[PDB]
Specification:
This is part of a larger assembly, with chains A (about 110 residues), B (about 90 residues), C (about 120 residues), D (about 70 residues), E (about 120 residues) and F (about 130 residues).
Chain B: H1 2-9, E1 14-19, E2 24-32, E3 38-46, E4 52-60, E5 65-69
Antiparallel strand pairs in B: 1-2, 1-5, 2-3, 3-4
Chain C: E1 16-21, E2 25-33, E3 41-42, E4 46-49, E5 70-73, E6 77-79, E7 84-91, H1 97-123
Chain D: E1 13-16, E2 24-31, E3 37-44, E4 49-50, E5 54-57
Antiparallel strand pairs in D: 1-2, 2-3, 3-4, 3-5
Classes of the chains: A alpha+beta (about 110), B mainly beta (about 90), C alpha+beta (about 120), D mainly beta (about 70), E alpha+beta (about 120), F alpha+beta (about 130).
Chain F binds 4 RNA strands through helix 1, strand 4, strand 5, helix 4 and helix 5.
PDB class: rna binding protein
Keywords: pre-mRNA splicing, spliceosome, E complex, RNA binding protein
Entry title: Saccharomyces cerevisiae spliceosomal E complex (ACT1)
RNA sequence: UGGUAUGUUC
RNA sequence: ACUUUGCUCGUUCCCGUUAUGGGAAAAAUUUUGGAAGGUCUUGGUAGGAACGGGUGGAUCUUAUAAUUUUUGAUUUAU
RNA sequence: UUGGGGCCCUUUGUUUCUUCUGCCUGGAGAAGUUUGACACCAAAUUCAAAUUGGUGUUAGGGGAGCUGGGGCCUUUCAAAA
RNA sequence: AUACUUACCUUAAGAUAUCAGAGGAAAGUCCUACUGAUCAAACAUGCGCUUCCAAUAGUAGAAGGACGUUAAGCAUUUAUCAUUGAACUAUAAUUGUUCAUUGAAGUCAUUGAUGCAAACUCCUUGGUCACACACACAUACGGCGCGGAAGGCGUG
């Protein structure tokens, strides 16, 4: 429990590694995504290229890569005064985990 | 792996490497590492906007390297051979 | 040129590649070797780049665009895998697949003979 | 993993370019396996203003480290 | 759970990989490496213009498309149709999947199910 | 409507679409079709392939008649004007000069143009069935 | 129970 | 579905009769599998099998998403 | 066996499998073919030879047997109708 | 070559196709020259499969180069910063202009760089194969000579 969290991972046994992954997904920061996976509530995800997606999480992963359904991407584009809101609907999408900045669970 | 070992073959021969900032360096390769850190000696250094200077030695961190150009004979080095047989290693 | 559908980067030894890097530069050369980090070794690779002055002819609108491309020649370079972005195949190898097979069987014969000799020489 | 080969640069004046623009010159006192380096009496070459009595540089930000002395 | 083992299951399906340049690669997908090195075959690299007049696009990725060797010389937009592209894994931002495939068959990790039955 | 007949063409292009486009480049360089590859060619069954009169080419792979091909034009006059373009200087495709002359029999598409200027098709198909005998 | 390296003797 | 019963039709043979019934089975036909032989072609012709280990190299998983390559500071931005 | 015609010889170290003999009024002769032979490189003993350490080469075509595979035909056997 | 002397080392683990079914040492493990289905590799072997394979009836041509010449081509555009003195225009602390002095750096180039375009010369590469010098074709074109190169698909 706590002792496997504190110990360095090169010492831990294989079953302890699998146990720590389940523990950090259940009682952790990524537990947020897990709740929205199970309660089937949409999340708002803010990407590194200044695009915002609204979607439901079908699966997620250690690197925060996630399979999403009913994805809606929102972005805005500006030159000088001019600004345009563009929006796009995608049915099913894989999202590599390194782009995400913040993930918000919708009430 | 083979490319890092090819860089170890080129020790003592004039290599030319371009860093990720844009600078070019051409000099003897004194020492190289498994991490690709290289130390060039008697090096002619071209800055990104083009100025050339002379440096006595330089140590570049190998993370910053784009490419390295080694001498042209090293295509005949034996680490490129596909079909090769070993002498049954000892205890 | 057609490339086999199940041809990974280990099959494409001695083909002529077209490696693309992050700064918009293309490296063209015979592929010699690769690694876990995907850092190649290219035999006669020639760097090309599009100058900033030629670049606005690429922007979407004559019939065919003509881009003078600044190329430098370098030889037997090793690239670094961090910079590589995607690779495309330009030309097939010099030797045919049958003729490549013949060479490989020959080289296996000669190598086995040489280590047999080195063994029997260290015995005496 | 493997410590960098800077045993010959110890206690000698050295100029290294932090990031891509800054250029810091100091006496090299120690190094790490990440190529962190700590050098005394640093100065930032542009007029050039001194940094402090003892500085450490994260080797993530070092590109090249040429030596302005004998070696 | 690693979703790369999910992504390896696809193996013969028309995807669209949207990379970090902005360039999008549409094509039939062959293998995926354990570092997400996609190898696609019948690909159609393209670079979407931003629909607002004054905004340019990525300029480096324009150079990258022309230098692939596949840009049609008469073509108006930046498209390059080329057999066999190979893509290093850190470049991929997102992968637009097909509409048809069932997620609830594919997302079952056989190894997780294996250990969970065993223990 | 009069089809020209060409001997001494190269017989190694193979694919008809590739053969027509390469020939048509050697006819009129910087043509519309020849300088844009991966355009569809018009199929004009009973859209000029090329301006200045060229309507179709027609080759076959039949081992009797390899190098020969037949270009059919819009009208009777352009057929004679095309010879005028040579002006007694032989056209050359690849490294071989192409002798050319008006055909002993007009083209089928040329007959379709003149007849519009299907019973004919009945006659031709019965001819084909008689030649199958 | 080893390897590579070094230099001396014959 | 099994068992008994007469009636109607039926690939082939026989009989009662050529209305039709009874009996027999593919023994005539085809497709599928195998053996042998013929013909034509295409490839090989000095190694091969079995056993073995403190044997080399590939691929895969985990350390490994924490500064030196792949879990983002190169869409030039406010 | 001899003669004639055509084409080829840049085969450039004049057939390039190796050695030795040899050639343009010619295309030839002898010996050899993988635990072997041949070519070449480097040294130092104070020329050469000697040895030790290396890199290569040992081929192309046709035939007989022996054998792997396909297509088509015949016979025989079994299950389907 | 031997031998002797030192000096430097003497290690990340684990694995070898998957799923299902029968058997052996209620849960799972292991195994089966066991059995199905999928996958992958090699080797044979085929498809009326798809693309490509250069004049000699001629002095050519195709593909790719030149880090080749014309060439100082033709058209644009570039060549420091601070301090002090002097004249100078001026709405002006003297902003503008010219000459000299001290200090600081300073890739070479200006016959350069950049934009455009054309001619010429030359290198590498290829079945420079066989039969032909032929009146075809709407279902548009016997893809009904032998090889070779590269892929696609199928079987064993």
């Amino acid at each position: 429990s706590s002792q496997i969290i504190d110990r360095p991972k090169h010492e831990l046994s294989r079953a302890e590694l699998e146990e720590l992954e389940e523990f950090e997904f259940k009682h952790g920061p990524m537990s947020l995504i897990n709740d929205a996976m199970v309660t089937r509530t949409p999340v708002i995800i803010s990407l590194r290229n200044n695009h915002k997606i609204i979607a439901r999480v079908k699966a997620f992963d250690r690197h925060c890569n996630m399979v999403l359904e009913n994805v809606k991407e929102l972005w805005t584009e500006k030159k000088g005064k001019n600004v345009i809101n563009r929006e796009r609907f995608i049915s099913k999408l894989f999202l590599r985990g390194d782009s995400v900045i913040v993930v918000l669970k919708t009430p | 792996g083979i490319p890092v070992k090819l860089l170890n073959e080129a020790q003592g021969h004039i290599v030319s490497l371009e860093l990720t900032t844009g600078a070019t360096y051409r000099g003897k390769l004194v020492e190289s590492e498994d991490s690709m850190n290289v130390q060039l000696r008697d090096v002619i250094a071209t800055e990104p906007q083009g100025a050339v200077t002379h440096m006595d030695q330089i140590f570049v961190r190998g993370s910053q390297i784009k490419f390295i150009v080694v001498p042209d004979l090293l295509k005949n080095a034996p680490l490129f051979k596909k079909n090769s047989s070993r002498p049954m290693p000892p205890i | 040129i057609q490339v086999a559908h199940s041809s990974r980067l280990a099959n494409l030894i001695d083909y002529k590649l077209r490696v693309l890097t992050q700064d918009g530069r293309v490296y063209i050369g015979q592929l010699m070797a690769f690694d876990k980090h995907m850092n190649l070794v290219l035999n006669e690779c020639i760097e090309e780049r599009v100058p900033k002055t030629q670049l606005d002819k690429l922007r979407p609108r004559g019939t065919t665009l003509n881009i003078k491309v600044e190329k430098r020649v370098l030889g037997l370079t090793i690239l670094r895998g961090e910079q590589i972005l995607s690779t495309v195949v330009e030309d097939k190898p010099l030797l045919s697949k049958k003729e490549r097979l013949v060479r490989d069987k020959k080289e296996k014969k000669q190598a086995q003979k040489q280590t047999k000799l080195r063994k029997e020489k260290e015995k005496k | 993993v493997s410590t960098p080969e800077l045993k010959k640069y110890m206690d000698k004046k050295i100029l290294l370019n932090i990031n891509g623009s800054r250029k810091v010159a100091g006496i090299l006192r120690g190094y790490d396996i990440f190529l962190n380096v700590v050098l005394d009496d640093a100065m930032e070459i542009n007029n050039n203003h001194q940094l402090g009595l003892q500085t450490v540089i994260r080797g993530n930000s070092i590109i090249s480290l040429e030596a302005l002395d004998a070696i | 759970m690693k979703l790369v083992n999910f992504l390896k299951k696809l193996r013969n399906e028309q995807v669209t990989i949207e990379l970090k340049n902005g360039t999008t690669v549409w094509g039939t997908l062959q293998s995926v490496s354990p570092q997400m090195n996609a190898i696609l075959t019948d690909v159609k690299l393209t670079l979407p213009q931003p629909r607002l007049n004054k905004l340019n696009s990525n300029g480096i990725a324009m150079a990258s498309l022309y230098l692939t060797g596949g840009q049609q010389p008469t073509a108006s937009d930046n498209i390059a149709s080329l057999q066999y592209i190979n893509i290093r894994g850190n470049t991929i931002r997102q992968i637009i999947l097909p509409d048809s495939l069932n997620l609830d068959s594919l997302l079952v990790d056989q190894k997780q199910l294996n250990s969970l039955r065993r223990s | 409507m009069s089809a020209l007949y060409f001997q001494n063409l190269p017989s190694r292009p193979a694919n008809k679409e590739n053969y027509t486009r390469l020939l048509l480049k050697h006819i009129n360089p910087n043509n519309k079709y020849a300088i844009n590859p991966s355009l569809p060619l018009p199929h004009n069954k009973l859209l000029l392939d090329d301006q200045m009169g060229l309507l179709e080419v027609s080759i076959s792979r039949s081992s009797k008649m390899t190098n020969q091909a037949f270009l059919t034009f819009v009208t009777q006059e352009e057929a004679d004007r095309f010879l005028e373009k040579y002006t007694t200087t032989a056209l050359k495709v690849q490294g071989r000069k192409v002798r050319m002359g008006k055909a002993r029999t007009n083209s089928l598409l040329g007959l379709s143009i003149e007849m519009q200027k299907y019973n004919l098709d009945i006659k031709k198909v019965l001819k084909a069935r008689k030649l199958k005998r």
